[PDB]
Amino acid sequence: ASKRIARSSIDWAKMAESVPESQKAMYNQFKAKSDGYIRKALSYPEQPSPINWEHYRKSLTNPAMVDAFKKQYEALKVPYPEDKVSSQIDAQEAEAKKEITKFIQESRG
C-alpha cells in the first residue's frame, strides 16, 4: 500500500563503478535478477482496472446481484502482505557494517 512504488531505484552508476566487474560478476547476475522483478513490477500497478458497474446494473434484468457483488467487492479490500526476511537483511547489514569497519581500518593500515 506504501513504501516502494515502481519509481524507486537506487543509483546503479556508483554501484557499477564500485564493483570490480568480473570479479563481482554476480552483480551482473544480480542486476538482471532485480531487473526481472522490475518486469513483474512493471505489470500489475496499485489500482486495478475500473469496472463500470452501472452498465451491468442496467443490462441485467435484476441488478440486485450486481449490487451484492459491488458491496462485497468494496467490503473485501485486502491490504499488503507482511515482510518476511527484513530482519535477516538488517542482521546482515550490521554484519556488513562490522566488515566495513574492519576493511576500512586494515586499508588505513
Binding site: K3, I10, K14, K40, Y44, E46, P48, S49, F103
Partner: protein, 53 residues
C-alpha cells in the same frame, strides 16, 4: 607502484561504502516481488468480478 597501490585501496574503500546501497537494493527487490504478487491478485480479483458480471 606505490601510488597505484594507494589508488587501488581507495577504490576498495569506496566499494565498501557502496555495500549499503546494495542492501537497500536487496530490500527494494524483496518489496518489488511482494508488490507484484499482491497487486496481481488485486488484478485477478477485479478480473474475477468482471467474469462474474
Amino acid at each position: 607502484g606505490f601510488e597505484e597501490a594507494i589508488t587501488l585501496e581507495e577504490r576498495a574503500q569506496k566499494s565498501a561504502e557502496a555495500q549499503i546501497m546494495l542492501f537497500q537494493a536487496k530490500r527494494e527487490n524483496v518489496q518489488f516481488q511482494l508488490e507484484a504478487a499482491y497487486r496481481a491478485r488485486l488484478h485477478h480479483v477485479n478480473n474475477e468480478i468482471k467474469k462474474r458480471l
